[PDB]
Scaffold this active site. Sequence first.
Site, PDB file in Angstrom:
ATOM      1  N   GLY A  24      29.256  74.785  42.665  1.00 39.06           N
ATOM      2  CA  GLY A  24      28.295  75.323  41.300  1.00 39.06           C
ATOM      3  C   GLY A  24      28.171  73.754  40.572  1.00 39.06           C
ATOM      4  O   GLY A  24      27.916  72.847  41.234  1.00 39.06           O
ATOM      5  N   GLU A  30      28.845  68.859  39.083  1.00 40.87           N
ATOM      6  CA  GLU A  30      28.841  69.819  40.144  1.00 40.87           C
ATOM      7  C   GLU A  30      30.557  69.893  41.146  1.00 40.87           C
ATOM      8  O   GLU A  30      31.085  69.496  40.579  1.00 40.87           O
ATOM      9  CB  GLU A  30      28.022  69.590  41.543  1.00 40.87           C
ATOM     10  CG  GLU A  30      26.310  69.452  40.954  1.00 40.87           C
ATOM     11  CD  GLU A  30      25.874  68.158  41.560  1.00 40.87           C
ATOM     12  OE1 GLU A  30      26.322  67.745  42.932  1.00 40.87           O
ATOM     13  OE2 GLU A  30      24.405  68.414  41.051  1.00 40.87           O
ATOM     14  N   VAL A  31      30.013  71.283  41.868  1.00 38.51           N
ATOM     15  CA  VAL A  31      31.777  71.421  42.274  1.00 38.51           C
ATOM     16  C   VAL A  31      30.774  71.934  44.005  1.00 38.51           C
ATOM     17  O   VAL A  31      29.755  72.379  44.040  1.00 38.51           O
ATOM     18  CB  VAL A  31      32.531  72.784  41.907  1.00 38.51           C
ATOM     19  CG1 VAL A  31      32.975  73.110  43.024  1.00 38.51           C
ATOM     20  CG2 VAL A  31      32.975  72.829  40.430  1.00 38.51           C
ATOM     21  N   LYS A  45      35.125  68.469  42.731  1.00 43.84           N
ATOM     22  CA  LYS A  45      34.461  68.430  41.806  1.00 43.84           C
ATOM     23  C   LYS A  45      33.565  66.399  41.369  1.00 43.84           C
ATOM     24  O   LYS A  45      34.891  65.738  41.727  1.00 43.84           O
ATOM     25  CB  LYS A  45      35.271  68.905  39.799  1.00 43.84           C
ATOM     26  CG  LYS A  45      34.470  68.924  38.907  1.00 43.84           C
ATOM     27  CD  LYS A  45      35.894  68.814  38.086  1.00 43.84           C
ATOM     28  CE  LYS A  45      35.862  70.076  37.382  1.00 43.84           C
ATOM     29  NZ  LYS A  45      37.194  70.084  36.196  1.00 43.84           N
ATOM     30  N   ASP A 136      43.218  76.857  27.424  1.00 35.85           N
ATOM     31  CA  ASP A 136      41.760  77.508  27.890  1.00 35.85           C
ATOM     32  C   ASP A 136      41.695  78.507  29.228  1.00 35.85           C
ATOM     33  O   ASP A 136      41.338  78.264  29.595  1.00 35.85           O
ATOM     34  CB  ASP A 136      40.859  76.475  28.687  1.00 35.85           C
ATOM     35  CG  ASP A 136      39.805  76.348  28.636  1.00 35.85           C
ATOM     36  OD1 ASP A 136      39.346  77.169  27.546  1.00 35.85           O
ATOM     37  OD2 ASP A 136      38.372  75.421  29.648  1.00 35.85           O
TER      38      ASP A 136
HETATM   39  C1  LIG Z   1      37.732  77.684  37.419  1.00 39.55           C
HETATM   40  C2  LIG Z   1      36.289  77.766  37.559  1.00 39.55           C
HETATM   41  N1  LIG Z   1      36.114  75.747  36.311  1.00 39.55           N
HETATM   42  C3  LIG Z   1      36.013  75.907  34.952  1.00 39.55           C
HETATM   43  C4  LIG Z   1      34.639  76.827  34.772  1.00 39.55           C
HETATM   44  C5  LIG Z   1      36.929  74.921  37.198  1.00 39.55           C
HETATM   45  C6  LIG Z   1      35.359  74.649  38.009  1.00 39.55           C
HETATM   46  N2  LIG Z   1      34.793  75.318  39.298  1.00 39.55           N
HETATM   47  C7  LIG Z   1      36.170  75.214  40.727  1.00 39.55           C
HETATM   48  C8  LIG Z   1      37.165  74.007  40.013  1.00 39.55           C
HETATM   49  C9  LIG Z   1      38.148  73.950  41.633  1.00 39.55           C
HETATM   50  N3  LIG Z   1      38.290  72.326  41.945  1.00 39.55           N
HETATM   51  C10 LIG Z   1      39.114  71.970  40.860  1.00 39.55           C
HETATM   52  C11 LIG Z   1      39.782  72.371  39.637  1.00 39.55           C
HETATM   53  C12 LIG Z   1      39.963  71.559  38.881  1.00 39.55           C
HETATM   54  O1  LIG Z   1      40.732  72.373  37.498  1.00 39.55           O
HETATM   55  C13 LIG Z   1      39.606  70.904  38.873  1.00 39.55           C
HETATM   56  C14 LIG Z   1      39.061  70.183  40.173  1.00 39.55           C
HETATM   57  C15 LIG Z   1      38.739  70.250  40.754  1.00 39.55           C
HETATM   58  C16 LIG Z   1      37.724  69.966  42.285  1.00 39.55           C
HETATM   59  N4  LIG Z   1      37.479  74.582  42.712  1.00 39.55           N
HETATM   60  C17 LIG Z   1      36.862  75.262  42.723  1.00 39.55           C
HETATM   61  N5  LIG Z   1      36.489  76.401  43.323  1.00 39.55           N
HETATM   62  C18 LIG Z   1      36.995  75.987  44.887  1.00 39.55           C
HETATM   63  N6  LIG Z   1      36.779  77.468  45.836  1.00 39.55           N
HETATM   64  C19 LIG Z   1      35.367  77.341  45.581  1.00 39.55           C
HETATM   65  C20 LIG Z   1      34.689  79.000  45.782  1.00 39.55           C
HETATM   66  C21 LIG Z   1      33.935  79.084  45.122  1.00 39.55           C
HETATM   67  C22 LIG Z   1      33.378  78.638  43.922  1.00 39.55           C
HETATM   68  C23 LIG Z   1      34.348  77.499  43.356  1.00 39.55           C
HETATM   69  C24 LIG Z   1      35.316  77.464  44.104  1.00 39.55           C
HETATM   70  N7  LIG Z   1      35.788  75.571  41.674  1.00 39.55           N
END
Ligand SMILES: CCN(CC)CCNc1cc(Nc2cc(O)ccc2C)nc(-n2cnc3ccccc32)n1
Length: 269
Positions: A24, A30-31, A45, A136
């Site tokens: 994303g 980006e993630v 992230k 949030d």
């Molecule tokens: C929860 C969604 N939001 C804000 C709307 C945060 C951004 N998306 C993320 C974050 C995340 N981990 C994460 C969470 C945090 O709060 C801070 C840092 C990180 C790396 N893992 C992921 N993530 C971990 N495995 C995944 C598989 C598919 C898509 C995304 C995936 N996504």
Amino acid sequence: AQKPWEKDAWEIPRESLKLEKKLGAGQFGEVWMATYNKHTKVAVKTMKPGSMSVEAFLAEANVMKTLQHDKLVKLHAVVTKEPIYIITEFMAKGSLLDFLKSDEGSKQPLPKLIDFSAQIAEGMAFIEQRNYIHRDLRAANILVSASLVCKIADFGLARVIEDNEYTAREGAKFPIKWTAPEAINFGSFTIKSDVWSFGILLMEIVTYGRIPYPGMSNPEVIRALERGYRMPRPENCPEELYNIMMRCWKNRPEERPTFEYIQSVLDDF
Ligand SMILES: CCN(CC)CCNc1cc(Nc2cc(O)ccc2C)nc(-n2cnc3ccccc32)n1
């Protein structure tokens, strides 16, 4: 006082990570799905340089150091030279909101929905108990693992509570359809305002990611709530589940239930 140039226990060298696939993106970065030292799948992230404060980007990881729990997304590491990374566990099915709107999420029966709800409640019970608030809470900010375990993410707004109230400054604006009325109107955040968001999140789950107050404007929502309106029970929503929502949406914060209580009701559904 930590030196700006000193690293901590959470730091890893950038070359230990191989960024495999972009999951994303947004205005702040980006993630990615990545592997750490070959055998370990993780999420990264990245911060877009210049998009925001480095100290704020990194402050999120500090909070996650403190809030370590099975039902909270798990911090593993950081890289603190630009490009700046935060590394967490990988959560194969992504965000709860996108999961539910997908083909697989759409095939999740009611008992699984309440399972998801219970897992989230457990995580919030822990946040409750640790004297923090999240501020949030919503489906967009929950992640889902390959074995269908839901975990709370996005701790950018999460804060320690001193004396049972956080007061936001007057110019703060917050997503209206998810935020407790008192928090919107006077900046009064408490664990009870998270309880309200959890009610809205329950409704999101049971409606498979449908927006709250579908078709209503934000000022209309604020006035409806003042008048006593609350969202009606969907077709597929069992009465007992809607009654917990309704308890979460009591006008008066102090009459809303604790997360411990919510967990236990959902646990024994
Ligand atoms: C929860 C969604 N939001 C804000 C709307 C945060 C951004 N998306 C993320 C974050 C995340 N981990 C994460 C969470 C945090 O709060 C801070 C840092 C990180 C790396 N893992 C992921 N993530 C971990 N495995 C995944 C598989 C598919 C898509 C995304 C995936 N996504």
